[PDB]
């Protein structure tokens, strides 16, 4: 079935992404603390709700938070400044905090129930955010023996996420804070905060996709060129 593409709000980042983040894919954004990974997540959670001719998918959102970083006030700000009703935009976000990595993994199964419920309504789930994908795994699986174990558990979690993306035509967007390991996301985007506080994005290990870097700003509309 044909994939959909969610605009990020930045023409530059959209071009880097071939039009936007894809359904039937896991897009991982990685970078240091303060890079803007969670800002992009908030922005996407509003953009996906737009109609397709405005770069959205008329979609609902599910959000798994591991760091208490979801900010309903930020959603409100982005929505208002894009002509949308903040309370309606919030209504179409379903939110859960993951207590630990095992609960995070179970929450993906829990999410499937709502996905099925909304599937043939006019606002099916089209975006599933996991922010942070890795923070609980990093704190729990640590020390001698942990690299293999952690990588195994994370790969299984990502397999579960790939299944939801692919079976239900959803864009999965995940964040990873990075200061040699295998990764199984579909597309990896390195984000950094540069001079002037501009954010800069580069695709990693994607030789057939745009070489170049996108640059964008964090604004009251989420992100913009």
């Amino acid at each position: 079935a044909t994939i959909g593409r969610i605009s990020t709000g930045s023409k530059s980042l959209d071009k880097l992404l071939g039009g936007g983040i894809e359904t039937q894919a896991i897009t991982e954004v990685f970078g240091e603390f303060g890079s803007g990974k969670t800002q992009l997540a908030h922005t996407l959670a509003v953009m996906v709700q737009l109609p397709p001719e405005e770069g959205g998918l008329n979609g609902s959102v599910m959000w798994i938070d591991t760091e208490n970083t979801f900010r309903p006030e930020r959603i409100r700000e982005i929505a208002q400044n894009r002509g949308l009703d903040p309370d309606e935009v919030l209504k179409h976000i379903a939110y859960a905090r993951a207590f630990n990595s095992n609960h995070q993994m179970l929450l993906v199964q829990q999410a499937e129930d709502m996905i099925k419920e909304l599937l043939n309504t006019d606002r099916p789930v089209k975006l599933l955010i996991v922010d942070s994908l890795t923070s609980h795994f990093r704190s729990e699986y640590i020390g001698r023996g942990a690299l293999a174990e952690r990588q195994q558990k994370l790969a299984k979690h990502l397999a579960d996420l790939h299944r939801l993306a692919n079976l239900y035509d959803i864009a999965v967007f995940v964040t990873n804070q990075v200061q040699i390991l295998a990764h199984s996301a579909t597309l990896r985007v390195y984000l950094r905060k540069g001079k002037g506080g501009k954010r800069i994005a580069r695709l990693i290990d994607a030789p057939h996709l745009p070489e170049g870097e996108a640059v964008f700003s964090i604004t009251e509309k989420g992100i913009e060129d």
């Binding site: 959000w63 979801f70 309903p72 959603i75 919030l90 976000i93 379903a94 939110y95 859960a96 999410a111």
Partner: peptide, 4 residues
């Protein structure tokens, strides 16, 4: 999950 709960609505926001």
């Amino acid at each position: 999950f709960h609505t926001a």
